[PDB]
Structure formats: structure tokens, C-alpha cells
Amino acid sequence: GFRKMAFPSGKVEGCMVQVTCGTTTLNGLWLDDVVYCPRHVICTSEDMLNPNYEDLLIRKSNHNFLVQAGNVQLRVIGHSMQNCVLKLKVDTANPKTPKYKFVRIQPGQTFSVLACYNGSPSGVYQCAMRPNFTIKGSFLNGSCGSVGFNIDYDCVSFCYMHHMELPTGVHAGTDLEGNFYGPFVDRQTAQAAGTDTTITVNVLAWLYAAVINGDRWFLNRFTTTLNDFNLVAMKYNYEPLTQDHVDILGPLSAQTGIAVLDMCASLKELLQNGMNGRTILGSALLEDEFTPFDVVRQCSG
Amino acid sequence: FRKMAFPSGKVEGCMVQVTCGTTTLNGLWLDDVVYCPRHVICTSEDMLNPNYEDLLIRKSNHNFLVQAGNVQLRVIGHSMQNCVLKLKVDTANPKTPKYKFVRIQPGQTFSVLACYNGSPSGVYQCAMRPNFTIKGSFLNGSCGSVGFNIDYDCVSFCYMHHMELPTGVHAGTDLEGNFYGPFVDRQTAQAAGTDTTITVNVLAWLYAAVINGDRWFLNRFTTTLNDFNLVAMKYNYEPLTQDHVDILGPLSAQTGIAVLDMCASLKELLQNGMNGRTILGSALLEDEFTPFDVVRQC
């Protein structure tokens, strides 16, 4: 019944440009009179093992940057670096600039990715930030600078800019202020993600969704403390819950009348006893890629 | 490996709200014409056996309220093509993309832009099921949402949403207003024919699993096309045509796995199951990726 559903991408499509240094092209995000893109656009292959980005930037001038919306050049009139992002001031304000914010998401939150190549969008899909600060994208060469976002009312919240792939095939990147999610750095080195864990808050959202749809065999008469639940959760490679997780489950708890800690007791029993050949929402597997917000969208609209 | 939808901006620029009485749904505004489901002209007294020709002749242009955002468009004419109402308006949409209307085949995929009150809400990839239903996420007010593919800068519209079935799947028309499947735009509980699994798509997805390093299900056995098809049909899988085998060529080459070798692996999965294992995260074989879908994303 539930599917991965992305936000409509049009407001973000109208902000995508390409940024080229020499023969190296990646994507950038054009908002008002600033283009945002990964700073490694200024790298050569020789620079990539461990670039001195500050040194590489001093040698760059505005006239070294080719910014294009489609085939139309956007003149660069200033440049600066903010953490791992390059900001290129341009001489034209993007007429399609939406209302927007830059947000830094928490692990477990979902967002839409507009996968782009040479400034042109190819596809849109929903991603979850894993607890180890990686995402399972579909990113090919040339996808850097593609962004992740959520849309609230008229307003686009940009939360992710793509920078790299890890040996295991997962992906890593920054917020739009250039700060990486997780311990990663933008160098052509092999870097390891932490062991991943299951996104507990999303599993709980899934159980609430099951209840909303009349599937509630797993509810019990008991409760737990948050600390007790977290200590058990960790033994099953589940993420510990935070206070923010408890809070964002508030609406679903209200919709069902099931206290968060009571659902935690139900989940604890599932982890300790298994499913015993039973299904939930038609699956023998628990799903962790739907947030409480995702559930409410697809259940209540 | 995840489902990927087409970027929806070209379609978002065409969505409007259409209202008649106490019924509101979505319309598609292309040039100076707005397309929408004709059941916008129904009421509760009509929905069970609506004589749409009688209902439509009794309507005036001024009974139709069309809003592009905060701007009302003036309806200067109306007509009906099968189950789609066509409202001529006095302004052309400058955001009209290059477009075509197509009727898709069962097994083909398309992107759905789900809308409510003329406002886009979500985008996702669907397949036209062999029984001509689609497994959508459509709520009250989603009617007139459209499905589409994009090729070059050209949008091919293939689906407009009309109804839900008691099993939770959905049914709709092409943009000429002809339903996919044996369904009717009346307020009745309708069942579909027996569904079948889209075999060529399952094979494409197994190839995707292989390209992604998942390969526990491969085997050295092989099979003929006909013997595979006999087993497929026993499990309510579509038989594989030679065209379908041809279409899988590029994925065969890329991975070096003969199509009929992948058929032999799928056969083993049908007869044995997956025994707790998963493929690309799923406990179930997925059939809503076409070979084209897999290739483009690889």
C-alpha cells in the first residue's frame, strides 16, 4: 500500500545549472544571484587525492568559472568557499527562485533527490539519510551537485548536495552550507561508513501506519521506559531513539491513541520474539524508510 | 536500486483545479484546452448510473470553475471525448510543453504526478498491470492527476486518474478518455481480472540485482524459452516473447548472462522461493522496472 513518493521536482528543476572548470563539469544550484556547487569542481585529477582547496581557490578568478543554465552563460562576479561548497555570485537573479530554506536534516529523515547531469534533471526519487550518514542514491559520474530537498507548502527546504561515493556503493554529501553529513571528506580516498543500523523511529511510524489500516495483532498491554527500549534496540542493530524521535511520533500517537512507549514495547517484543510467520502490512520484513511525515502524507493526505 | 520518476516540472506547469457544484478535481491545461475526468459533472444522485450525455447537455460553460492557482480561467466551450471532458478556455498556457497523447501497453511504466485541488503533491513511478490496474497512491480529490513519460523535451501523457477498486488498486483512462481495462466511471465496487506478474520486468530487475553485486540466485542450469514459459504461466507470470528476449539483450551483454540463463534462475526462484533471502532489499520479486528503466539508470 505504501510506496516511495518524491516531492514534485519542478521548483528545483528551475534552479539547476552546470558549473565547469576546464573540462570538469558538475551541477550547481542557482538561487537569487548565487550559484552553489561542490568545491571539488576546481580540482584536477592530480589534486583529488588530497587537494589544498584554499590554495586551489587563490589561483582561480571569476573568469575561470563557466556557469550555464542550459546553453546560456551566467556571468560570475564573485566567488567564495564555505566549508565544502563553492558560492559563485552571478550577475542575474534567478527568476525561478522559489521560496527556500537551507536545512540540515537528522539521520532517518527522508528527502527527494533530483538526479542531474550537466545541469539537466534525469529523475527524482526519495532517499532516507541512514544512521551512519550515508544515502543509497542512484548517482553516476557527473551527478555531483545534485540536491536533496523537501517541500513544505510553497517553500523548498534544501538539505543535501551530492559529493561522493563510498566503496560499499553508498553515497555521501553535505548540507547547503557545505558541512558533510558524517565523518567524510571530499578527497579521492577510500572512506568507510560506520556500520549501518535500522531507523527505529521509521519502523515505529510503520507500525503506527499498520494500526491505522487495521493491522494490529502486535499490540500488547505493556509499556517500557525509553532507556530500557534503547538498550534492547542497540542489541538488535536498531538506532536508539532521541527525544526528537519521540516528538515527531506525536501526531501518529494521537491519531491511534497508542502512546509512543507502548508502541516501543510492541516493537521490543517483535525484536525479541520475531514475527512467527506473521506479516505486518503484508510483509514479513519491517520497513524503515518511511518517516512519520511520510506515513501521514500517504494515509491522510 | 530504487524506482525513479521523471522530473515533473513540465507537467506541474499544466495542472489546474476544476470545479462543478460541490465536486472539485484536477485538470490538465494544454494550449487553450483543459482536460479532466467527466465525472466532475456528477452529483450523489447521479454517481450510480450517470447518463453523461444527458448530464453534459444540461451544463453551461459558466457552471465550470477552472482556477490556475489564484486566477480563474473563463470556459468558452466544452465537449466530451469518452470519459474525458474538454474545456476550452480563452487563454493559452505558456508553460505548455511539447507533448503527445499515448496509450501505453500493459507492462510499461510511467510517472504519476499526484495532485489535489490543482496542486501537485507527489511524484512516483507506476506500471500498467497486465489486468489494466495500477498500484497507485491516490486519495480523495486525486482525480485528473496524470501519468506520463518524457523523451527528449517531449511529454507523453498516458494516464488520467478516475477511480479506486475495493482491493486498493486504481483505474483510469488515456487522454482520449478510454479506460484501461474493463472499468466504468460509475460509483460501484469493481473487480479486475486476475493479475499476472510482468516477467520481462522481473528479469530486468534480476539483471539490476546482478549489476549491483547481488547474485546468490544465479545458477548454472539453463532452460528453453518454451519450458520457462510453461513454468511461468503455472505461477501466473506472463510468458516471455522473443521480442522481450531481444529487449533484454543490452542487459545480457552488460552482465554476460544469457537471457535464458536468467530465466533458469527465475524458474528456480518461483519453484523454491527465496528462503528468507532478499534481492535488492526485497523479500518479493519486483516487476515494475522495465528493461529501459534499468538501463537508463545504469
Coordinates of C-alpha atoms in Angstrom, one line a residue:
Chain A
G1 CA 0.0 0.0 0.0
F2 CA 2.9 2.3 0.7
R3 CA 5.4 3.4 -1.9
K4 CA 8.4 5.8 -2.0
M5 CA 6.9 9.1 -3.2
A6 CA 9.1 12.1 -4.1
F7 CA 8.1 15.7 -4.0
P8 CA 7.3 17.4 -7.3
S9 CA 10.6 18.5 -8.6
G10 CA 9.6 21.5 -10.7
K11 CA 10.7 24.2 -8.2
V12 CA 14.1 22.6 -8.0
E13 CA 14.4 21.9 -11.7
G14 CA 14.1 25.7 -12.2
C15 CA 17.2 26.2 -10.1
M16 CA 19.7 23.6 -11.7
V17 CA 22.7 24.9 -13.6
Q18 CA 26.0 23.5 -14.7
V19 CA 29.4 24.7 -13.4
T20 CA 32.5 23.9 -15.4
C21 CA 36.2 24.4 -14.7
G22 CA 38.3 23.3 -17.6
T23 CA 36.7 20.1 -18.7
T24 CA 35.3 19.2 -15.3
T25 CA 31.5 19.9 -15.2
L26 CA 29.1 19.3 -12.3
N27 CA 25.8 20.7 -11.2
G28 CA 25.0 23.8 -9.3
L29 CA 22.0 25.3 -7.6
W30 CA 21.0 28.9 -8.6
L31 CA 19.1 30.8 -6.0
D32 CA 18.7 34.6 -6.3
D33 CA 22.2 35.7 -7.5
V34 CA 24.2 32.9 -6.1
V35 CA 25.2 29.5 -7.5
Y36 CA 26.1 26.8 -5.0
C37 CA 28.1 23.8 -6.0
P38 CA 30.7 21.3 -4.7
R39 CA 34.1 22.9 -4.3
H40 CA 35.9 20.0 -6.0
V41 CA 34.8 21.4 -9.3
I42 CA 38.1 23.3 -9.0
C43 CA 40.2 20.1 -8.7
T44 CA 42.2 18.3 -11.4
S45 CA 42.7 14.6 -11.1
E46 CA 46.1 15.4 -9.7
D47 CA 44.6 17.5 -6.9
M48 CA 42.0 15.0 -5.9
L49 CA 43.9 12.6 -3.6
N50 CA 44.3 15.4 -1.1
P51 CA 43.6 18.8 -2.6
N52 CA 44.7 22.0 -0.9
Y53 CA 41.4 23.7 -1.6
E54 CA 42.4 27.1 -0.2
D55 CA 45.5 27.1 -2.4
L56 CA 43.5 26.0 -5.5
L57 CA 40.9 28.7 -4.9
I58 CA 43.5 31.6 -4.7
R59 CA 44.6 30.7 -8.2
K60 CA 41.0 30.9 -9.5
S61 CA 39.4 34.1 -10.9
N62 CA 35.8 34.8 -11.6
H63 CA 36.5 34.4 -15.4
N64 CA 37.7 30.8 -14.9
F65 CA 34.2 29.6 -14.0
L66 CA 31.7 28.6 -16.7
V67 CA 28.2 28.7 -15.3
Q68 CA 25.4 27.8 -17.7
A69 CA 21.6 27.5 -17.5
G70 CA 21.0 25.2 -20.4
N71 CA 23.4 26.7 -23.1
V72 CA 23.1 30.2 -21.7
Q73 CA 26.1 31.5 -19.8
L74 CA 25.7 33.2 -16.4
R75 CA 28.5 35.7 -15.7
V76 CA 30.3 35.1 -12.4
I77 CA 31.1 38.3 -10.5
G78 CA 32.4 36.8 -7.2
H79 CA 33.5 33.6 -5.6
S80 CA 34.0 32.3 -2.2
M81 CA 34.2 28.9 -0.4
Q82 CA 32.0 27.9 2.6
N83 CA 33.2 24.6 4.0
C84 CA 32.9 22.1 1.1
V85 CA 30.7 24.3 -1.1
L86 CA 31.7 27.0 -3.6
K87 CA 29.4 30.0 -3.9
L88 CA 29.6 31.8 -7.2
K89 CA 27.9 35.2 -7.3
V90 CA 26.4 35.8 -10.7
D91 CA 25.1 38.9 -12.4
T92 CA 21.5 37.7 -12.8
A93 CA 18.9 36.8 -10.1
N94 CA 17.2 33.5 -11.0
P95 CA 13.7 34.4 -12.0
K96 CA 12.5 31.0 -10.9
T97 CA 13.9 31.2 -7.4
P98 CA 11.3 29.6 -5.1
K99 CA 10.7 30.4 -1.5
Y100 CA 13.5 28.4 0.1
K101 CA 15.5 27.5 3.2
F102 CA 18.7 25.6 3.9
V103 CA 18.1 22.9 6.5
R104 CA 20.4 20.2 8.0
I105 CA 18.4 17.0 8.4
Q106 CA 18.8 14.3 11.0
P107 CA 19.6 10.7 10.2
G108 CA 16.4 8.8 9.4
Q109 CA 14.8 11.8 7.7
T110 CA 13.8 11.3 4.1
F111 CA 14.1 13.7 1.2
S112 CA 13.7 13.8 -2.6
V113 CA 16.8 13.8 -4.8
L114 CA 16.7 15.4 -8.3
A115 CA 19.4 13.5 -10.0
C116 CA 21.1 15.8 -12.5
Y117 CA 23.8 15.6 -15.2
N118 CA 25.3 18.6 -17.0
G119 CA 22.7 20.7 -15.3
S120 CA 19.7 18.7 -16.8
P121 CA 17.5 16.6 -14.5
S122 CA 17.2 12.9 -15.2
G123 CA 15.0 11.6 -12.4
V124 CA 13.6 12.1 -9.0
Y125 CA 13.4 9.7 -6.1
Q126 CA 13.0 9.5 -2.3
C127 CA 16.0 8.8 -0.1
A128 CA 16.5 8.2 3.6
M129 CA 19.5 9.5 5.4
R130 CA 20.9 6.4 7.1
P131 CA 22.1 6.5 10.8
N132 CA 25.7 6.3 9.5
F133 CA 25.1 9.5 7.4
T134 CA 25.1 7.8 4.0
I135 CA 22.4 7.6 1.5
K136 CA 21.5 4.9 -1.0
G137 CA 21.2 7.0 -4.1
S138 CA 21.3 6.4 -7.8
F139 CA 24.3 8.6 -8.7
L140 CA 26.6 8.2 -11.8
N141 CA 29.6 10.2 -12.8
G142 CA 28.6 13.8 -13.3
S143 CA 25.9 13.7 -10.6
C144 CA 27.8 15.8 -8.1
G145 CA 25.9 19.0 -7.2
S146 CA 22.5 17.2 -7.4
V147 CA 20.5 18.2 -4.4
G148 CA 18.1 16.7 -2.0
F149 CA 15.1 18.6 -0.7
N150 CA 11.7 18.6 0.9
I151 CA 8.8 20.9 0.0
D152 CA 6.6 22.4 2.8
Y153 CA 3.7 24.5 1.4
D154 CA 5.3 26.8 -1.2
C155 CA 8.8 26.5 0.4
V156 CA 11.7 24.3 -0.7
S157 CA 14.0 23.1 2.1
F158 CA 17.3 22.1 0.6
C159 CA 19.0 19.6 2.8
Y160 CA 21.6 17.7 0.6
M161 CA 24.2 18.3 -2.1
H162 CA 25.9 15.3 -3.6
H163 CA 29.7 14.9 -3.5
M164 CA 30.9 11.3 -3.5
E165 CA 30.6 7.5 -3.4
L166 CA 31.9 5.2 -0.8
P167 CA 33.5 1.8 -1.5
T168 CA 30.3 0.0 -0.4
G169 CA 28.3 1.8 -3.1
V170 CA 26.5 4.2 -0.8
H171 CA 26.8 8.0 -1.2
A172 CA 27.9 10.9 0.9
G173 CA 27.4 14.7 0.7
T174 CA 26.9 18.0 2.5
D175 CA 24.2 20.3 3.5
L176 CA 23.9 23.5 1.5
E177 CA 26.3 25.2 4.0
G178 CA 29.0 22.8 2.8
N179 CA 29.2 20.7 6.0
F180 CA 29.4 17.0 5.3
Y181 CA 26.9 14.6 6.8
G182 CA 29.1 12.1 8.7
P183 CA 32.8 11.9 9.1
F184 CA 33.6 12.1 5.4
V185 CA 35.9 14.5 3.4
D186 CA 35.9 15.5 -0.2
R187 CA 39.0 13.7 -1.4
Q188 CA 39.5 10.8 -3.8
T189 CA 40.3 8.4 -1.0
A190 CA 38.5 5.2 0.1
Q191 CA 36.5 6.0 3.2
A192 CA 34.4 3.7 5.3
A193 CA 31.0 4.4 6.7
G194 CA 30.1 3.2 10.2
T195 CA 28.1 0.0 10.5
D196 CA 24.5 0.9 9.5
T197 CA 21.6 0.4 11.8
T198 CA 17.8 0.3 11.4
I199 CA 16.0 3.6 11.7
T200 CA 13.8 2.8 14.7
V201 CA 11.6 5.9 14.5
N202 CA 10.6 5.0 11.0
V203 CA 9.9 1.4 12.0
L204 CA 7.6 2.8 14.7
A205 CA 6.0 5.0 12.1
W206 CA 5.4 1.9 10.0
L207 CA 3.8 0.1 13.0
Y208 CA 1.5 3.1 13.5
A209 CA 0.6 3.0 9.8
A210 CA -0.2 -0.7 10.2
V211 CA -2.5 0.1 13.1
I212 CA -4.2 2.9 11.1
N213 CA -5.0 0.3 8.4
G214 CA -6.5 -2.1 10.9
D215 CA -3.4 -4.4 11.2
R216 CA -2.8 -4.6 15.0
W217 CA -2.1 -8.1 16.1
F218 CA 1.3 -7.0 17.5
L219 CA -0.1 -4.5 20.1
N220 CA 0.3 -5.6 23.8
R221 CA -0.9 -4.5 27.2
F222 CA 2.5 -3.3 28.4
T223 CA 4.9 -0.4 28.2
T224 CA 8.6 0.3 28.6
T225 CA 10.9 3.1 29.5
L226 CA 12.8 4.8 26.7
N227 CA 16.1 3.8 28.2
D228 CA 15.1 0.2 28.5
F229 CA 13.9 0.2 24.9
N230 CA 17.1 1.8 23.6
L231 CA 19.3 -0.7 25.4
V232 CA 17.4 -3.5 23.8
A233 CA 17.2 -1.8 20.4
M234 CA 21.0 -1.5 20.3
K235 CA 21.4 -5.2 20.8
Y236 CA 19.4 -5.7 17.5
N237 CA 21.3 -3.1 15.5
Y238 CA 18.4 -0.6 15.8
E239 CA 19.2 3.1 16.3
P240 CA 18.4 4.4 19.7
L241 CA 15.5 6.8 19.9
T242 CA 16.1 10.5 20.7
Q243 CA 13.6 12.9 22.3
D244 CA 13.1 14.4 18.8
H245 CA 12.0 11.0 17.6
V246 CA 9.5 10.7 20.3
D247 CA 8.2 14.1 19.5
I248 CA 7.8 13.5 15.7
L249 CA 5.8 10.4 16.5
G250 CA 3.3 12.6 18.4
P251 CA 0.8 13.0 15.6
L252 CA 0.6 9.3 14.9
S253 CA 0.4 8.5 18.6
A254 CA -2.5 11.0 18.8
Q255 CA -4.2 9.5 15.7
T256 CA -4.2 6.0 17.2
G257 CA -4.3 6.7 20.9
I258 CA -1.2 4.4 21.3
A259 CA 1.5 6.1 23.5
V260 CA 4.9 6.1 21.9
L261 CA 6.4 4.0 24.7
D262 CA 3.6 1.4 24.4
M263 CA 4.4 1.0 20.7
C264 CA 8.1 0.7 21.8
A265 CA 7.0 -2.2 24.0
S266 CA 5.3 -3.8 21.0
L267 CA 8.4 -3.3 18.9
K268 CA 10.6 -4.7 21.6
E269 CA 8.5 -7.9 21.6
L270 CA 8.8 -8.2 17.8
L271 CA 12.6 -7.9 18.0
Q272 CA 12.8 -10.5 20.8
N273 CA 10.2 -13.0 19.5
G274 CA 10.2 -12.3 15.8
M275 CA 7.2 -12.4 13.6
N276 CA 6.3 -16.1 13.9
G277 CA 5.3 -16.4 10.3
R278 CA 3.0 -13.4 10.6
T279 CA 3.1 -10.3 8.4
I280 CA 2.5 -6.6 9.0
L281 CA 1.1 -4.6 6.2
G282 CA 1.6 -7.7 4.1
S283 CA 5.3 -8.0 4.7
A284 CA 7.4 -10.3 6.9
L285 CA 10.0 -7.5 7.0
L286 CA 9.8 -4.3 8.9
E287 CA 10.2 -1.1 6.9
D288 CA 12.4 1.7 8.0
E289 CA 12.4 4.1 5.0
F290 CA 9.1 5.9 5.8
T291 CA 9.1 8.7 8.3
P292 CA 6.2 9.7 10.5
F293 CA 5.6 12.6 8.0
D294 CA 5.7 10.2 5.0
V295 CA 3.1 7.9 6.7
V296 CA 0.7 10.9 7.3
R297 CA 1.0 12.1 3.7
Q298 CA 0.1 8.7 2.2
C299 CA -2.6 7.8 4.8
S300 CA -4.3 11.1 5.4
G301 CA -3.2 13.3 2.5
Chain B
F1 CA 18.3 0.1 -6.8
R2 CA 15.3 2.4 -6.4
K3 CA 12.3 3.4 -8.5
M4 CA 13.0 6.7 -10.3
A5 CA 10.3 9.0 -11.6
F6 CA 10.7 11.5 -14.4
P7 CA 11.2 15.1 -13.4
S8 CA 7.7 16.5 -13.0
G9 CA 8.2 20.2 -13.7
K10 CA 6.9 20.2 -17.3
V11 CA 3.6 18.6 -16.0
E12 CA 3.3 20.8 -12.9
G13 CA 3.0 23.8 -15.1
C14 CA -0.1 22.4 -16.6
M15 CA -2.1 21.4 -13.5
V16 CA -5.3 23.4 -12.7
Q17 CA -8.3 23.0 -10.5
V18 CA -11.8 22.2 -12.0
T19 CA -15.0 22.6 -10.0
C20 CA -18.6 21.8 -10.8
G21 CA -21.1 22.3 -8.0
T22 CA -19.6 20.6 -4.9
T23 CA -17.2 18.4 -6.9
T24 CA -13.6 19.5 -7.4
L25 CA -10.7 17.7 -9.1
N26 CA -7.7 18.3 -11.2
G27 CA -7.4 19.3 -14.8
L28 CA -4.6 19.3 -17.4
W29 CA -4.2 22.7 -19.2
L30 CA -2.5 22.4 -22.6
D31 CA -2.7 25.3 -25.1
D32 CA -6.3 26.6 -24.6
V33 CA -7.9 23.3 -23.5
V34 CA -8.3 21.8 -20.0
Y35 CA -8.8 18.1 -19.9
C36 CA -10.3 16.4 -16.8
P37 CA -12.5 13.4 -15.8
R38 CA -16.0 13.9 -16.9
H39 CA -17.4 12.7 -13.5
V40 CA -16.8 16.2 -12.2
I41 CA -20.3 16.9 -13.5
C42 CA -21.9 14.2 -11.3
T43 CA -23.6 14.5 -8.0
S44 CA -24.6 11.9 -5.4
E45 CA -28.0 11.5 -7.2
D46 CA -26.1 10.6 -10.4
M47 CA -23.0 8.7 -9.5
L48 CA -24.6 5.2 -9.5
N49 CA -25.8 5.2 -13.2
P50 CA -24.7 8.5 -14.7
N51 CA -26.1 9.3 -18.2
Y52 CA -23.1 11.5 -19.0
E53 CA -24.6 12.8 -22.3
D54 CA -27.7 14.0 -20.5
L55 CA -25.7 15.5 -17.7
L56 CA -23.4 17.4 -20.1
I57 CA -26.1 18.9 -22.3
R58 CA -27.7 20.3 -19.1
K59 CA -24.4 22.2 -18.2
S60 CA -23.4 25.7 -19.2
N61 CA -19.8 26.9 -19.7
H62 CA -20.4 29.1 -16.6
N63 CA -21.0 26.0 -14.4
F64 CA -17.3 25.1 -14.8
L65 CA -14.9 26.9 -12.4
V66 CA -11.3 26.5 -13.6
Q67 CA -8.5 28.0 -11.5
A68 CA -4.9 28.2 -12.4
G69 CA -3.6 29.0 -8.9
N70 CA -5.3 32.2 -7.8
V71 CA -6.5 33.1 -11.4
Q72 CA -9.9 31.9 -12.7
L73 CA -9.9 30.9 -16.4
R74 CA -13.0 31.6 -18.5
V75 CA -14.5 28.5 -20.1
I76 CA -15.7 29.4 -23.6
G77 CA -16.7 25.9 -24.7
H78 CA -17.0 22.3 -23.5
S79 CA -17.1 18.8 -25.1
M80 CA -16.7 15.2 -24.1
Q81 CA -14.4 12.5 -25.6
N82 CA -15.2 9.2 -24.0
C83 CA -14.6 9.6 -20.3
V84 CA -12.6 12.9 -20.6
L85 CA -14.2 16.4 -20.5
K86 CA -12.5 19.0 -22.6
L87 CA -13.0 22.7 -21.5
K88 CA -11.9 25.4 -24.0
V89 CA -10.6 28.4 -22.2
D90 CA -9.8 31.9 -23.5
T91 CA -6.1 31.9 -22.5
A92 CA -3.3 29.6 -23.7
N93 CA -0.9 28.1 -21.2
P94 CA 2.6 29.5 -22.0
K95 CA 4.0 26.6 -19.9
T96 CA 2.6 24.0 -22.3
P97 CA 5.5 21.6 -23.0
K98 CA 5.9 19.7 -26.3
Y99 CA 3.6 16.8 -25.8
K100 CA 1.8 13.8 -27.2
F101 CA -1.1 11.6 -26.0
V102 CA -0.2 7.9 -26.0
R103 CA -1.9 4.7 -24.9
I104 CA 0.6 2.6 -23.1
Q105 CA 0.8 -1.2 -23.1
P106 CA 0.5 -3.4 -20.0
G107 CA 3.9 -3.9 -18.5
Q108 CA 5.0 -0.4 -19.4
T109 CA 5.9 2.1 -16.7
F110 CA 5.1 5.8 -16.3
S111 CA 5.5 8.6 -13.7
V112 CA 2.4 9.8 -11.8
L113 CA 2.1 13.4 -10.6
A114 CA -0.5 13.1 -7.8
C115 CA -2.4 16.4 -7.4
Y116 CA -5.1 17.7 -5.1
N117 CA -7.1 20.9 -5.7
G118 CA -4.9 21.5 -8.7
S119 CA -1.8 21.5 -6.6
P120 CA 1.0 18.9 -7.2
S121 CA 1.7 16.8 -4.1
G122 CA 3.9 13.9 -5.1
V123 CA 5.5 12.0 -7.9
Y124 CA 6.1 8.3 -8.3
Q125 CA 6.7 5.5 -10.8
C126 CA 3.8 3.1 -11.7
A127 CA 3.4 0.2 -14.1
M128 CA 0.3 -0.6 -16.1
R129 CA -0.6 -4.0 -14.7
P130 CA -1.5 -6.9 -17.1
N131 CA -5.1 -6.6 -15.7
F132 CA -5.0 -2.9 -16.5
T133 CA -5.0 -1.6 -12.9
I134 CA -2.2 0.5 -11.5
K135 CA -0.9 0.3 -7.9
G136 CA -1.1 3.9 -7.1
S137 CA -1.2 6.2 -4.1
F138 CA -4.4 8.2 -4.8
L139 CA -6.7 9.7 -2.2
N140 CA -9.9 11.6 -2.4
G141 CA -9.6 14.5 -4.8
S142 CA -6.7 12.9 -6.8
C143 CA -8.9 12.5 -10.0
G144 CA -7.4 14.2 -13.0
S145 CA -3.9 13.5 -11.8
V146 CA -1.9 12.3 -14.9
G147 CA 0.7 9.8 -15.7
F148 CA 3.5 10.5 -18.2
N149 CA 6.9 9.7 -19.7
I150 CA 9.4 12.2 -21.0
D151 CA 11.5 11.7 -24.1
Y152 CA 13.8 14.5 -25.2
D153 CA 11.9 17.6 -24.2
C154 CA 8.5 15.9 -25.1
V155 CA 6.0 14.8 -22.5
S156 CA 4.0 11.7 -23.5
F157 CA 0.7 11.7 -21.4
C158 CA -0.6 8.2 -21.0
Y159 CA -2.9 8.2 -17.9
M160 CA -5.5 10.2 -16.2
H161 CA -6.8 9.1 -12.9
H162 CA -10.5 8.2 -12.3
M163 CA -11.3 5.6 -9.6
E164 CA -10.3 3.2 -6.9
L165 CA -11.1 -0.5 -6.7
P166 CA -12.0 -2.3 -3.4
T167 CA -8.7 -4.1 -3.4
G168 CA -6.9 -0.8 -3.2
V169 CA -5.6 -0.6 -6.8
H170 CA -6.7 2.1 -9.2
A171 CA -8.1 2.6 -12.7
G172 CA -8.1 5.4 -15.2
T173 CA -8.1 6.3 -18.8
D174 CA -5.7 7.5 -21.5
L175 CA -6.0 11.2 -22.5
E176 CA -8.6 10.2 -25.2
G177 CA -10.8 9.1 -22.3
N178 CA -10.8 5.4 -22.9
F179 CA -10.3 3.3 -19.8
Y180 CA -7.5 0.9 -19.4
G181 CA -9.3 -2.3 -18.6
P182 CA -13.0 -3.3 -18.1
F183 CA -13.8 -0.4 -15.7
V184 CA -16.5 2.2 -15.8
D185 CA -16.8 5.7 -14.3
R186 CA -19.7 4.9 -12.0
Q187 CA -19.8 4.7 -8.2
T188 CA -19.7 0.9 -7.9
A189 CA -17.3 -1.6 -6.4
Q190 CA -15.5 -3.1 -9.4
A191 CA -13.1 -6.1 -9.5
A192 CA -10.3 -6.6 -12.0
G193 CA -9.4 -9.7 -13.9
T194 CA -6.7 -11.9 -12.4
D195 CA -3.5 -10.1 -12.3
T196 CA -0.2 -11.6 -13.6
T197 CA 3.4 -10.8 -12.9
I198 CA 5.3 -8.9 -15.6
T199 CA 8.0 -11.4 -16.4
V200 CA 10.3 -9.3 -18.7
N201 CA 10.3 -6.7 -15.9
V202 CA 11.3 -9.2 -13.2
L203 CA 14.1 -10.4 -15.4
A204 CA 15.3 -6.8 -15.9
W205 CA 15.2 -6.3 -12.1
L206 CA 17.3 -9.5 -11.5
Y207 CA 19.8 -8.1 -14.0
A208 CA 19.8 -5.0 -11.9
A209 CA 20.5 -7.0 -8.8
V210 CA 23.4 -8.7 -10.6
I211 CA 24.9 -5.4 -11.8
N212 CA 24.6 -4.3 -8.1
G213 CA 26.6 -7.4 -7.0
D214 CA 23.6 -9.3 -5.7
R215 CA 23.8 -12.8 -7.3
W216 CA 23.0 -15.6 -4.8
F217 CA 20.1 -16.6 -7.1
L218 CA 22.1 -17.3 -10.2
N219 CA 22.6 -20.9 -11.3
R220 CA 24.4 -22.9 -13.9
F221 CA 21.2 -24.6 -15.1
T222 CA 19.6 -23.4 -18.2
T223 CA 16.2 -23.7 -19.9
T224 CA 14.4 -23.3 -23.2
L225 CA 12.1 -20.5 -23.8
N226 CA 9.0 -22.7 -24.0
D227 CA 9.9 -24.7 -20.9
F228 CA 10.4 -21.4 -19.0
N229 CA 7.1 -20.2 -20.2
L230 CA 5.3 -23.3 -19.1
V231 CA 6.5 -22.8 -15.6
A232 CA 6.0 -19.0 -15.7
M233 CA 2.3 -19.5 -16.7
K234 CA 1.8 -22.0 -13.9
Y235 CA 2.8 -19.3 -11.4
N236 CA 0.7 -16.6 -13.1
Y237 CA 3.7 -15.0 -14.7
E238 CA 3.3 -13.6 -18.3
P239 CA 5.0 -15.8 -20.9
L240 CA 8.2 -14.2 -22.3
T241 CA 8.1 -13.4 -26.0
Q242 CA 11.1 -13.3 -28.4
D243 CA 10.6 -9.6 -28.6
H244 CA 11.0 -9.5 -24.8
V245 CA 14.1 -11.7 -25.1
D246 CA 15.5 -9.2 -27.7
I247 CA 14.7 -6.3 -25.4
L248 CA 16.8 -7.8 -22.6
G249 CA 19.9 -8.1 -24.9
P250 CA 21.7 -5.0 -23.7
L251 CA 21.4 -6.1 -20.1
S252 CA 22.5 -9.6 -21.1
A253 CA 25.7 -8.3 -22.8
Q254 CA 26.5 -5.8 -20.0
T255 CA 26.4 -8.7 -17.4
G256 CA 27.4 -11.6 -19.7
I257 CA 24.4 -13.6 -18.5
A258 CA 22.3 -15.2 -21.3
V259 CA 18.7 -14.2 -21.1
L260 CA 17.7 -17.9 -20.9
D261 CA 20.2 -18.4 -18.1
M262 CA 18.4 -15.6 -16.1
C263 CA 15.1 -17.4 -17.0
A264 CA 16.5 -20.5 -15.4
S265 CA 17.4 -18.6 -12.3
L266 CA 13.9 -17.0 -12.1
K267 CA 12.4 -20.5 -12.6
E268 CA 14.3 -21.7 -9.5
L269 CA 13.0 -18.7 -7.5
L270 CA 9.4 -19.5 -8.5
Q271 CA 9.6 -23.1 -7.5
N272 CA 11.8 -22.7 -4.4
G273 CA 11.1 -19.2 -3.2
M274 CA 13.9 -17.1 -1.7
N275 CA 14.2 -19.0 1.6
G276 CA 14.5 -15.9 3.8
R277 CA 17.0 -14.3 1.5
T278 CA 16.3 -10.9 -0.2
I279 CA 17.2 -9.4 -3.6
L280 CA 18.0 -5.7 -3.6
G281 CA 16.4 -5.5 -0.2
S282 CA 13.1 -7.1 -1.2
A283 CA 11.5 -10.4 0.0
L284 CA 9.5 -10.3 -3.2
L285 CA 10.3 -10.3 -6.9
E286 CA 9.7 -6.8 -8.3
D287 CA 8.0 -6.4 -11.7
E288 CA 7.6 -2.6 -12.1
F289 CA 11.0 -1.9 -13.7
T290 CA 11.2 -2.2 -17.5
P291 CA 14.5 -3.1 -19.2
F292 CA 14.6 0.5 -20.3
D293 CA 14.1 1.7 -16.7
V294 CA 17.0 -0.5 -15.6
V295 CA 19.3 0.5 -18.4
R296 CA 18.8 4.3 -18.2
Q297 CA 19.5 4.1 -14.5
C298 CA 22.6 2.0 -15.2

